[PDB]
A = this chain, B = another copy of it.
Amino acid sequence: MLEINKIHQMNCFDFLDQVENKSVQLAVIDPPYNLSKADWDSFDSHNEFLAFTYRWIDKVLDKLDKDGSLYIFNTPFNCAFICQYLVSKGMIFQNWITWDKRDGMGSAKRRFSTGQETILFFSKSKNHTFNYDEVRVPYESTDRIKHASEKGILKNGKRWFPNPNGRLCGEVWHFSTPKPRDLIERIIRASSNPNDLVLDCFMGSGTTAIVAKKLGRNFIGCDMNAEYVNQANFVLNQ
């Protein structure tokens, strides 16, 4: 039995083989993207990259319980292949999330400038957890116009007030190496509940564990890098 709530210094396949099947409620995975940003992100070909990816995906799917949720980050191009692969495995597509980075980067002169990233969101069944009221976003200028057209329409004889926490979150996200904590927070608030178990087999700086712990979720995870693991476990403990 693998110790929960501590990041382990393990290869993802070794780690995954130690995880109990059907024990995980949410898996949030930011894996290699094949962009050659490091030795672990360099592959000989696109097929080798996909074979590696599909191998870890298969194991992660065995870990999810019957209604579990899955989020996988990658470039849009790699997500096209991963999306079709997940459909072929029986997973249920929920959303193609677009992270609009709006950074200063991506400049190109043979094509539009890059930088967006994709998050695929699938679930094991149609009875997954989706806490929509916990991830609402601030109302726009245009939501307020709609609010004005409905203000005079009474409900049950009285004025109706729209939710004070904002509008339902959509699929194109914009925020203020590690993923932004607010981004991972939206994922964990929407697709898990307090005390559920969250898995991340490429922990990196430990963002998934850190945010899971702050939100009262349990986590299980690993990274092959000793320095990253020790540094993240230290952050978790204070």
Chain A residues proximal to chain B, CB less than 8 Å? 76-77, 79-81, 83-84, 93-98, 100, 102, 104, 106-116, 118, 121, 126, 128, 130, 132, 140, 142-143, 146, 155-156, 167-172, 190
Contacts and interface: CB of A to CB of B under 8 A. Distances in A.
7 contacts: A84-B84, A95-B114, A104-B146, A106-B169, A113-B170, A115-B170, A116-B170
Nearest to A153: B104
B114 A171 contact: yes
B130 A110 contact: yes
A131 B114 CA distance: 16
Contacts of A111: 94-95, 121, 130
Contacts of A94: 110-112
B84 A114 contact: no
B96 A77 contact: yes
B112 A171 contact: yes
Contact of A113 (B79, B115, B168): B168
Contacts of A168: 106-109, 112-113
A98 B95 contact: no
Please list the 6 inter-chain residue pairs (A to B) with the smallest Cβ-Cβ separation, ordered nearest first.
A76-B96, A80-B83, A106-B168, A80-B80, A113-B170, A94-B111
Nearest to A106: B168
Nearest to A132: B109
Contacts of A98: 76, 98, 100, 116, 172
A114 B170 CA distance: 6
Contacts of A93: 77
A167 B109 CA distance: 11
B140 A104 contact: yes
A128 to B, nearest CB: 8
Contacts of A109: 130, 132, 168
A46 to B, nearest CB: 9
